[PDB]
Amino acid sequence: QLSGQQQRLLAFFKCCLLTDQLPLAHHLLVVHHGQRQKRKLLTLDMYNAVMLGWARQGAFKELVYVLFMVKDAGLTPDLLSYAAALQCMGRQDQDAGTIERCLEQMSQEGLKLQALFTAVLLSEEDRATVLKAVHKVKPTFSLPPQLPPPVNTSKLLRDVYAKDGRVSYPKLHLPLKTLQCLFEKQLHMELASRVCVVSVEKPTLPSKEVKHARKTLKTLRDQWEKALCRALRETKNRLEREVYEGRFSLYPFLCLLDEREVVRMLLQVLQALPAQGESFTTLARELSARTFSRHVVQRQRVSGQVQALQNHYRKYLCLLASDAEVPEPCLPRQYWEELGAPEALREQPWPLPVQMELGKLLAEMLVQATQMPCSLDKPHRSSRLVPVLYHVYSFRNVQQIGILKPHPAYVQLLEKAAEPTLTFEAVDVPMLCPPLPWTSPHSGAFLLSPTKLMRTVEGATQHQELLETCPPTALHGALDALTQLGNCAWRVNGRVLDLVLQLFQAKGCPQLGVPAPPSEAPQPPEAHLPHSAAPARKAELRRELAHCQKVAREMHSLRAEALYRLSLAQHLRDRVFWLPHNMDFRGRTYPCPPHFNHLGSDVARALLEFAQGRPLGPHGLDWLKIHLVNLTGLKKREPLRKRLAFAEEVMDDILDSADQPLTGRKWWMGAEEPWQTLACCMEVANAVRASDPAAYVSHLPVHQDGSCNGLQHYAALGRDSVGAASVNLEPSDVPQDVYSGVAAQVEVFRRQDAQRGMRVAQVLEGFITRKVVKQTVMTVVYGVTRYGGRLQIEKRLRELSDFPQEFVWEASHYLVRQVFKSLQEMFSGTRAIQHWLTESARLISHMGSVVEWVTPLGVPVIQPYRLDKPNTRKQKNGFPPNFIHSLDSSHMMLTALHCYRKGLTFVSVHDCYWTHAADVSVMNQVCREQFVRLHSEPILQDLSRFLVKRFCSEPQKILEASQLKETLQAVPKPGAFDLEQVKRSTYFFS
Amino acid sequence: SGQQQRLLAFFKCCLLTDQLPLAHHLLVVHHGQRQKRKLLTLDMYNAVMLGWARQGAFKELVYVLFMVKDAGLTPDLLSYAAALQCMGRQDQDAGTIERCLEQMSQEGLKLQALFTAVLLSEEDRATVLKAVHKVKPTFSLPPQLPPPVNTSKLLRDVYAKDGRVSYPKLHLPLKTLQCLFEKQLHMELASRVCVVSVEKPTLPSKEVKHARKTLKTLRDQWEKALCRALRETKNRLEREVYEGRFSLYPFLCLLDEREVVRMLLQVLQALPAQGESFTTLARELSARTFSRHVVQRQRVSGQVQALQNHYRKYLCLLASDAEVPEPCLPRQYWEELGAPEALREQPWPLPVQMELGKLLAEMLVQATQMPCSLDKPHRSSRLVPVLYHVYSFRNVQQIGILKPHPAYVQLLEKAAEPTLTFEAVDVPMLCPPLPWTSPHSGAFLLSPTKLMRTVEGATQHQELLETCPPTALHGALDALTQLGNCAWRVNGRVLDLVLQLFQAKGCPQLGVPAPPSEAPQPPEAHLPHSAAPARKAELRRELAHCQKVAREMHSLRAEALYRLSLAQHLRDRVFWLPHNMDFRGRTYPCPPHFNHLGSDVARALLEFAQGRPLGPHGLDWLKIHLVNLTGLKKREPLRKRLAFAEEVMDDILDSADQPLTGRKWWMGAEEPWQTLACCMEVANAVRASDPAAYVSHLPVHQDGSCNGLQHYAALGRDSVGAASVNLEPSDVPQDVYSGVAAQVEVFRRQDAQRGMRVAQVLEGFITRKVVKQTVMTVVYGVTRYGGRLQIEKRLRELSDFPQEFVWEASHYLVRQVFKSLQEMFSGTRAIQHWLTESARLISHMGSVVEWVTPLGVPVIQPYRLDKPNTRKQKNGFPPNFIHSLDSSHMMLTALHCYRKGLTFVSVHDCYWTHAADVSVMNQVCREQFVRLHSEPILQDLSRFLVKRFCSEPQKILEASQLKETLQAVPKPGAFDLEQVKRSTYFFS
């Protein structure tokens, strides 16, 4: 293994190279080498770092001095050190004989020069210096030719990669010059890394108290900045003493970012810090990530990599631009590969313990430096000054990790001030230019800010290691799909935005989902009274207050989230923007901006519509009407003809809702998805108002979704005739709702349980609505051991006023068990697959390894569950949802790539597939075809054989691995139902 | 303003630290800014000149003098003396000194008068006189005056010059007293005492040794961290000295850095598992630093040696073997002899002290680090705070609480360290206390002890004491000195039995805390999370209640362990308990950890080291006192109780011989350990051939049923009141509490008929033991929740009584007792209502009520509203005035008993004295009570309040109403005052 000391010393040496403090790295290395025990901790790569850093400052003498230390340690110089030495020799410009002698010494060891250069990664400047040194010597350069980017030879991906002649790739509507200007704006945003957005909430005319509060907030922040600068200087001096002593220090890490940048960033953190508060460890991780991102941006700027990125990006923009024409159309990643932009050396992050130590130091400096009076400076500096941040321990013992809470007075000051400027990170806001193509897992999305492929922080290092272990050829399909999802252009709808802004400014609406303001919140009417003075009653009053304040606290968190989302929507209202997409561990694609994203809320779904415009065509108007009926949720069981007829019947309501959403009949409010229903009525009204519906262009996406996507995968895997009919895989004239059947089975179980002693069924009698059973089914299948999913089922039960909330906790558990039995009964295949997957997972977890599998697309997925070793219950429960999530992601990526060959704009939000109304029919045919192709491959057998290779061939526990082999061998038998029927089924997605 | 005070305190500390160039850096910056020059006060200039005189640098002092000249205010007499002091050091010419005297004479009084007017240090006054001597004008030093004596009739007999005085002399020889003084001096210089823990020490396990080694490494790591943080803060503060801002650097310099580091560690040891308030800790840290600083300053000056010589001369008077020709009071002896006066006795200003304490506390919290020391990982990668701040519900208020982490607590328990560190003030003195010549200086010789133990109202009360004539203070000071002079020895037998029970569980009835402190609760609760949301919350609340109840026992265990630790440390050594005065004036023992007032067990342990023979009546008194401790036959006469003692004598002897394995009759008694000790003293008496020959060290307690009620019944002379409280002579003693219980019972019957069900809850549970505390809360409690909590605690002890309505029952009980008192006694109500109305009106005006006792020591109520508090002053005044009268009566009794030679101390109502002395003490205390009420206290109170508040221009109309209220004093009743002398049941 590798001990922690090497992972701190290596980080310190590399960091000291990036800060031009080589005399200090030399000092520390001298002290370390001098002590025998510390010399053991010193590794060859650290020496290959110190020498390389000296080898850029043009110092050959110190290089040979460190070489005396390398020989003294007994290490043998590797390919890296020889190359650093050759790169240093050229700078001194000594005669070619020395270079030839170095080549002779290299020849004595088992090493070459071209092979050594290929094997060991080097910077472009240093590689050029080495090459120039070799050119000075007698040997010619003799550079081997490059390797043309390979393509995936998987049966699923051979269509997209083999271009042939059937290519109709899409091109962005915006002209090339507009894309370049947008890129320059995004580049400016990335450089400053702070986006200032006007607060959407209406600003009242400032009162005298409000003005005073703003002057207080300005004075305080300035005092906090001076204090932060002083604290940073003191910490830097102490850490420099640690450098001279010979112990690992964070002094270069502090040096990498400018002092003013550190101070301003900490102040920005305080503004972003919610009233609720944030965990200290999370805050430290966030601070370290911000420091690393701003350092990567600064390093790229000083190196000149940014300018090369601009030229390469402009050439890449020519492909996307409609006006510019490229002779051979190719996928965006492939085009970027043809340009050959150089992946940055600094893209890789620091080691995780060092990052934690740095972030904790920044948070500790912030709390100690910032002090404000509880009295808020109303008395003349008589009241004690107390730190703004307060460490809070949930458990008194030092074993529980403490968290951080903002000052109560500071929160009040923030409210009273009502500042209109909102500070956002560059990563947080959506990109103003098309995202950088995902050439590699590590490098993609935001151009200047590194975005790792895995958004999840749990198990991040392991999954990334698997990503690099996997051949790049396999990864490319997922990377191409992610690039395609990023390339889609989004424009904020003006009308929907205006209506939500209206409601948001004053009161809001709960049914619509516009969060209520603090004034609306149920504040307690009176404080403890003389009659209530009894300590029992006072304690009860404090508990009710704790509940009321908890509800108010949640409402503030929801309104603040809505405020940020609508402020970004207003900011990006007139400007076309691109949402980059990132992959979780399960492989589901999630948009990188947290604050503004379509998945997060229904209102966000309504706001977002495609900037690119495609005409409706003959069937587009009908698809819009069918979409409108789907959003209401009326006649879901009824076929698409009945839905269209209902749309014609309710057309008068549709038009009236479009003309007046607020003062109208408000039929859209009655619909299950109100804002999306309103947007669809404001597109159908525009279509009918236009003389030709086919001529009219529908920006708004149309969403097609299976009732449960996991159930359809399970049904496909087992080929169950009953299962296919239930989830609509089998063609039918009338679609069958899979949730209704689960509800009926839960109802018969409820009747049986009512006869039994248990009263939970009696409590739930008449309240087991179909929507609750749908959320429960999704929680059971997609969600694994989730407190939030169970809280969501509980939330659905709470929404029903008639249902008593005294037994909501056990009613939710009962619903989870009854659904888990219902599905297992109705679906013969699903239970067998789930049981086999769980049994295999538990056996792998017990042996001490985490379950690892490769998706049919090719990207490896590893469960990140860690018992403080794999967690037996979590891994065994986690494997069926994660496997079916990986299958759903693979099907979505296949659908996306094939729809990109035909030119359709495709994005995926949860189960729903979003595309233009004209494109819907083609997208439906493509997704049925891809689903059939995905399940045509023997998914279960491939998984069984990969698990056998990964874990069954284990010396440590052969017998348990033998039992695992026996359970893996008994794969479920395919049923009578034909796979090809899925293509013919128009109700597979609807 | 406050800042000027802060800068002045900084200047005084700077002179002692000798950082005068640093003071000159601050002074020039302060003069340069016009506003800062206005902030500078004349005294700041005088200070630095005195320091420059010690240094000898004449030109800086001349610069300060010119700076005074530039300011334009008159040059003060304090500065001229400092200039002369400087001139003396470098051997300057006398003629210039005579010119300096001419400047001193100008705009000032004459050379003698100017010297008298301005206070100076012992070196300073000598230097000023020596500088005066060289000049042609004569020094003309004023003649001294003999110490004044009070002319008040009550204290006239005490101060009478007739040679009837027979002051008691301590049994210990003079040489032994000097050795004890040397031991006390060694304790004072060290300032800390190490005592072996009474609790049994188990053989250390491997885990226990590992925890001890870890604790040692942590405490030395803490000392390194504190020393480095202290140096860094000192450097920053020195940079603030140059910036001219307020700095705490000289304060930190006055105490040695090693001493400060060790003080911080001692405070961590003092902090308990529950935790202590941060502001209180800051005050305690500043007080400890001031005490150590005063000890160091006295040591370096050489005042300590003069104190030793003067105190040995004082010791000769107390010593039996040494003979003094003229008997004098202990204060009077010191006044006649040369008296060392320490200028540094006066404390630092309170806001600066708060700032210094906060700085020390912050340094303590950030410097120290504890990681819990994972034994197997041993990796320092976690937040490491020894102390954690809690919101405690009120976050806007931002009250500061500092509590140690449970990990520390578990480690301290695992190590089971025997050594315990106590402050010198905390432990009882090993030598007789210093005589109370002045209010500010008394009690501990090296550690300053102010008269006012209370921190609330401390400033105002001390100012009133200084305003008060010295002789009136002197009478109370003489009484306090007499109480301190009493010698206490720990009874070995009682302590042994307590230690054995303390080691092994003990007994709740005996008050012994329980070491296990376990409470049935699911230990792991539910291993899977949330078996049921309600049940989880229920168990969490139940575990929280168990944690609180267990913490109660831990605090009681620590208090008892500390008590016995001190009792063991002082078991073989005679010690003296100093006594101070609260705002009311009811004297209190200075040592907090070990005191007789604190617990009954301490009362049992403590017996007089000085020994007086029983005499003919001593055995009878001891038997009577045994009956008093049990509390049986209280109604029955003093002869019947004696007969009962003869009846139960076999049980008495058996219990003394075998307390643990005997009939345990003592445990059944109301005061068990006291009963056991008295049974061992009666057994020792009967074992001896002559009981009169036998010497009884044990005190005998004479206590009135209610001291306050007797005062009330005496002031109004109501016949019914006097008969109930035993002032009227009776053959069968009448108990006031029994009558109150009967009246409460009839009110309970009336309320039971009414809709209110509180009476039904209390039916059959209003026992006299409970009704007694309520009377004490009405008569002595001053809007105190804690006394009402004591009533609730008494209700909880009865298992049958439901605790669901205990709070309402306590409120009902206090109201009914209050409403039983007024109807039972007309005089008590007539006086209480008048006092409650007068205080209310004075509180409305905006002045706190101030009144002078018949002895003459002023008493001021300290209650404040964040101005006087309306709901506090009116309730507070009847008990505070009664407490002042009770204190006056006890002081008069103490002084007259001292004249006779009886050893007298007072613990609450209970008067403690030797068994032979009891009869004489009884007669003396009846005589003093009659004399105290012979003076018209109500009229004197009314006249003094008229002088203090009625002559107010601001609100004359309210003052007129107050004048009318004061004029209507309650009329004297038919009952004769002289009857109290004839009544043998006043105290019993």
Side-chain angles (χ1 to χ4, degrees), chain A residues 50-108 110:
Chain A
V50 186
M51 293 187 275
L52 197 150
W54 277 122
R56 278 182 253 115
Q57 287 194 345
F60 185 73
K61 44 177 73 62
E62 275 98 345
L63 193 141
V64 187
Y65 188 50
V66 182
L67 286 172
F68 301 143
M69 311 187 163
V70 172
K71 299 177 184 69
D72 198 16
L75 301 170
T76 58
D78 66 334
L79 313 176
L80 262 176
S81 43
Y82 269 127
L86 276 172
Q87 169 269 337
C88 183
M89 189 159 284
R91 276 180 141 127
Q92 293 296 109
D93 195 77
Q94 52 208 358
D95 45 350
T98 78
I99 306 153
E100 281 176 354
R101 252 179 307 274
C102 185
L103 259 68
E104 286 320 296
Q105 294 288 307
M106 195 167 333
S107 71
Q108 289 162 0

Side-chain angles (χ1 to χ4, degrees), chain A residues 508-522:
Chain A
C509 191
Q511 298 102 13
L512 296 191
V514 178
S519 48
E520 184 70 31

Side-chain angles (χ1 to χ4, degrees), chain A residues 876-986:
Chain A
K876 83 176 298 180
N877 291 354
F879 193 58
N882 294 357
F883 179 63
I884 303 301
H885 269 315
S886 88
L887 296 194
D888 197 22
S889 69
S890 299
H891 163 233
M892 167 257 303
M893 285 161 186
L894 275 178
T895 306
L897 289 181
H898 284 89
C899 285
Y900 193 82
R901 293 188 65 81
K902 294 138 194 277
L904 321 174
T905 315
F906 182 92
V907 293
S908 175
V909 176
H910 297 283
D911 276 12
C912 307
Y913 284 174
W914 292 30
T915 193
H916 290 93
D919 304 352
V920 172
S921 51
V922 185
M923 189 283 300
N924 275 329
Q925 302 151 28
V926 168
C927 71
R928 299 160 203 173
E929 166 79 22
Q930 298 311 311
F931 190 81
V932 167
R933 287 171 57 176
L934 187 67
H935 292 277
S936 292
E937 324 294 330
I939 307 301
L940 309 157
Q941 278 281 108
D942 299 341
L943 172 79
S944 174
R945 284 176 335 251
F946 188 71
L947 293 187
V948 160
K949 159 165 89 71
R950 273 288 296 110
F951 317 105
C952 287
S953 51
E954 184 65 16
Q956 190 252 332
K957 280 152 77 171
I958 316 181
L959 275 299
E960 179 151 339
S962 300
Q963 183 180 354
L964 171 65
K965 214 177 310 178
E966 291 140 21
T967 197
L968 291 169
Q969 182 63 257
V971 297
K973 189 44 73 177
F977 154 83
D978 185 23
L979 188 57
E980 309 299 311
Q981 300 185 216
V982 178
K983 296 187 195 299
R984 296 190 320 259
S985 183
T986 62

Side-chain angles (χ1 to χ4, degrees), chain A residues 357-378:
Chain A
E357 297 153 354
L358 176 64
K360 284 172 180 54
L361 177 65
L362 290 171
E364 180 186 1
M365 283 164 37
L366 182 59
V367 178
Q368 178 187 0
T370 62
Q371 290 202 1
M372 52 164 292
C374 58
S375 290
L376 269 179
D377 298 285
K378 264 189 176 50

Side-chain angles (χ1 to χ4, degrees), chain A residues 384 390 393 396 398 542 809, chain B residues 388 397-398 403 405 530:
Chain A
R384 61 267 187 178
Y390 294 101
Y393 268 73
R396 271 306 275 111
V398 175
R542 186 56 59 90
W809 189 91
Chain B
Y388 160 76
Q397 192 165 349
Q398 188 60 95
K403 307 166 308 305
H405 272 230
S530 69

Side-chain angles (χ1 to χ4, degrees), chain B residues 712 715 831-832 834-836 838-839 842 849-854 859 861 877-878 880-882 884-885 935-950 962-963 965-967 969-970:
Chain B
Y712 273 127
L715 283 168
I831 304 161
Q832 222 187 1
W834 167 57
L835 296 154
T836 317
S838 301
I842 301 160
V849 191
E850 304 180 8
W851 67 104
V852 161
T853 65
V859 172
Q861 309 188 213
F877 189 69
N880 290 359
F881 178 62
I882 290 300
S884 78
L885 297 194
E935 324 293 330
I937 322 179
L938 304 175
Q939 270 286 338
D940 299 347
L941 171 72
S942 70
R943 274 133 47 185
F944 189 71
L945 294 187
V946 159
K947 263 72 161 176
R948 273 288 297 110
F949 317 104
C950 288
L962 171 65
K963 215 179 311 178
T965 316
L966 291 173
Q967 185 171 359
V969 288

